[PDB]
Symmetry: C3
Subunit: 291 residues, 3 copies
Amino acid sequence: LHSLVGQHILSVQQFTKDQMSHLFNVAHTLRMMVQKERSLDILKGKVMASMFYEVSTRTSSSFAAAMARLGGAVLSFSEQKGESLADSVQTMSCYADVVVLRHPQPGAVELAAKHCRRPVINAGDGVGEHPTQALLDIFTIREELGTVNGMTITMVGDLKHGRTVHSLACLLTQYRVSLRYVAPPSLRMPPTVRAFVASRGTKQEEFESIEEALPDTDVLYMTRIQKFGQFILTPHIMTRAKKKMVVMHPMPRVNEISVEVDSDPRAAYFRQAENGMYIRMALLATVLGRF
Amino acid sequence: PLLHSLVGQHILSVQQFTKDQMSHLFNVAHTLRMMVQKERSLDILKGKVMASMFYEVSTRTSSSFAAAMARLGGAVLSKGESLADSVQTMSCYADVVVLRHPQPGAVELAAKHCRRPVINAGDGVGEHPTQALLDIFTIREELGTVNGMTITMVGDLKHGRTVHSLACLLTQYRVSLRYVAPPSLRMPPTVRAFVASRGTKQEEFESIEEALPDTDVLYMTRIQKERFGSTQEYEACFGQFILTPHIMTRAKKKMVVMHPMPRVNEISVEVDSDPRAAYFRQAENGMYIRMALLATVLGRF
Amino acid sequence: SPLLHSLVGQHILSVQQFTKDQMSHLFNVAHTLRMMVQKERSLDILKGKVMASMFYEVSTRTSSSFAAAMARLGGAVLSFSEGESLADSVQTMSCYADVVVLRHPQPGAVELAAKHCRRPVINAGDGVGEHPTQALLDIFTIREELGTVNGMTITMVGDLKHGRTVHSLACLLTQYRVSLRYVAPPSLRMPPTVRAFVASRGTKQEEFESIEEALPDTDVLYMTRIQKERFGYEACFGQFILTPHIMTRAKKKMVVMHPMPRVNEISVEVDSDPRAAYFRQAENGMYIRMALLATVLGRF
């Protein structure tokens, strides 16, 4: 009842908190079966089409890996004024049981899914919506700290542009949280983001460096800036973060986290990526109606 | 037994298929399709590997073979060094090779010495054996028979190499043929004369409207605006090779529209909702025809 | 344990890290596995396991060999396509994969990536250029073909100054009883680095100027490329090329090998000659790689 069977998965909006939880439990069960190395044939005979038109390789790899580890196969669309995307999507759905689609044009992911006879999982659309990233982001917080509820979640870097940070903020208003924003004056959190957050009644506070936002941070959620030192997490700056907290990062990083924070047990940006495989495994299994 | 299958054989042309062999392959695709529908654990090509070598792009063909392979339970292995050596090196790893190469002769010589069977996925003389087989399968499926059908090929028929081969295959059937091109790009007289030698009837028209009333199979292809035999012609002309729901109101109830795909504008999206719009089922049929090919060539049917 | 000579969960960075009984064991597994493939014995050895294929120099013969090996054992493969560091990608792949096969041309990059990688990394060619499984399969091939490696004469042809596989193989041979011969152009000799060390290890070395010259006493003709721009060409190009005419001066118990790809240096007419084992050497590579993948992942 709580698995989104045969449906398109375009935004994290569509999950009732109970479908969200079911998804998290199912990813927990898949993980444990993997750890004890069971013969997994859940999606044996099933085919996933991977259609990436903006290149995220964490996304494409985790999804492909996820499908392999269920016993499924992947067809990857490696394919200049060709056919309409919806036709390319329709045709691949003649071969596959589900389509994973990342497209940067606004509207497109949804327009491709529209008359598609198979379920399209959105892996990143034109408005930077990206549900499995949001789902793995929450799932991680709960995994690392026990609970999402009652935490301070601090976001660092280019918050003006990176539209998945703005995905997570809104979704985090379904929980009891306080949101901190670190960002240089030019790249601050946009207003209608902050308006929705306030509109749903979530406490928010802007800070100018990591150092000053840190001692009360439970989740330090880091992001690249691109084109200074007030947004670069270092082991120096870490001597101030609580003992229990976790540092997350959707990846890739370049500058924003020093390699020497990696052996910090609170550094969770690799565990985070692995959680991604497992929630994606759950979404696949669930979308194809086995779990 | 396996008296109907091409076990071990290079698959280079549809001309190397008899009535019986094609009939076997259609029944197997059928059989394999049903097994897939009933969710049957297919490990038919478990322990098998397919090398996929596509030197020209054709997302329709290549994705199709990988899908077919993956559903039989097998694997798919997806510059400077000669084609002979490349193919022969892949054949050290894999059981079958699926080869698409645009250089006239290239597929042929690559197979010549190959230790493993080779399936032509599209060559430079426009032989594409699985395209022709999926086309004829899709006709029989959709209409209940190929025999007695009036088949009407539409677009750039002079340079439609696989469509010659297809009009040339439809020899082995009792059919009637029609052609709908711009006078520039009419069906060639090379092939027209080969189909006339057979006793298969041919007629030409300038539009879809003209040819459409007693058409059983509308096989749409596109022009490419550059390939019009003049811009004068284009502007007096193009409206006659574009299918819309209004054109279709004159089509027979019992009728099917096909396309090899992809399309540009020649088939309006509004057509897609028509029950007679087969071109997507056409693409699914190719996967099941390719499943049937890999499995028989590799000795499992 | 029967995997007492298996390098389970260990980064495979160089062949000079394999003991003889370790390499012998791996050869034993390579064959056992080939025979299963021949029998169509159900190989669920790595079923459910994922290999990450990360190739930054498009060595498409070598990546396809690995991809073949993983699939024949029932595993699965993730292709890689290329801000982020090398070591980050490889760490990130290792979150998804059970083993990373990595080939990268920058000096020290492979070791750098494996250093803090939490999954075993198999070097598929590094920037010096250790190619562990190429060396292993060359040795395995000599032994399949001739029945021994000891006491053999091995003639390496071609661009010896620049040929990577020659350098590590020629070093790898000094652990056996062999006689090494070198047929390079005057300029493109076996480098003084390599020549100097094989002397220090016992093995005999001897430079020649032509294959016809070297061939009568050659058990393994290990051919390699020369190409236009390395000469620094007209006068000496014909002498380093294999034709069936050149092959009349060869033993009957003799093998011609080539890591490949090959262009001019082995005439197409030679391929029907039963002493030509370079395609069998390619197939041999797949079985060495299954053994390696299966040994690293705790199944042999």
